[PDB]
């Protein structure tokens, strides 16, 4: 164990060499392979409910990959974020719970009611983003997940010279409870909040 110098450069660092260690040379590459593109492998997981036998060529990889996702435990609870369009909100709400770069408030309230403090489930892998020095909250919607010490997740390099940062990718079937919804309000737009918690 080399000194730390100026601590961690960008948060995730260390997590991200230690999980890479653990992995064998199939499983890094399958981890990529993952990467490039995932939208087949989680379109699948949330169309059959994170049920698998139906595509046994996709359930392969889908099983090598939750195991190598199993490799490295939280050391200690930790904050992840997603940006989010208000399509996260299914139809009832995207079109309707903003106007002209404000939130509808008699919208939000009903959108609160039917998700706060309730238990939710993404069949998918879910990706999210470790904070450095920059939190990208550009987007309409903005999701901070409490992550537990002794959760499973994986770590993906998504950093270049001038953006990007470590992302904490947690595994398919993970569960959240939804503690607190609200809305942030900027000098010149609102973003709506959601603070979550990962059920281990």
Do not use: C
Not at 27 to 35: D, M
Not at 82 to 104: A, L
Not at 122 to 132: A, D, K, P, Q, R
Not at 145 to 152: F, I, Q, T, Y
């Amino acid at each position: 164990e080399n000194l730390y110098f100026q601590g961690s450069h960008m948060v995730g660092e260390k997590e991200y060499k230690a999980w890479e260690k653990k992995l064998r040379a199939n499983e890094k590459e399958l981890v990529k392979e993952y990467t490039a593109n995932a939208k087949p492998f989680n379109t699948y997981l949330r169309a059959n409910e994170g049920k698998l036998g139906f595509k046994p060529e996709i359930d392969k990889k889908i099983l090598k990959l939750d195991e190598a996702l199993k490799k490295s435990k939280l050391s200690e609870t930790v904050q992840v974020y997603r940006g989010d369009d208000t399509s996260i909100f299914g139809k009832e709400f995207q079109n309707s719970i903003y106007q002209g770069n404000k939130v509808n408030r008699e919208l939000f309230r009903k959108l609160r009611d039917e998700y706060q403090g309730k238990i939710r489930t993404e069949y998918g892998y879910l990706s999210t983003s470790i904070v450095s020095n920059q939190q990208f909250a550009m987007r309409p919607v903005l999701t901070t997940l409490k992550v537990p010490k002794g959760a499973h997740a994986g770590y993906v390099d998504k950093i270049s010279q001038y953006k990007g940062q470590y992302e904490l990718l947690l595994p398919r079937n993970t569960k959240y409870k939804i503690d607190k919804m609200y809305i942030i309000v900027n000098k010149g737009s609102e973003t709506i909040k959601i603070e979550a918690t990962v059920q281990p």
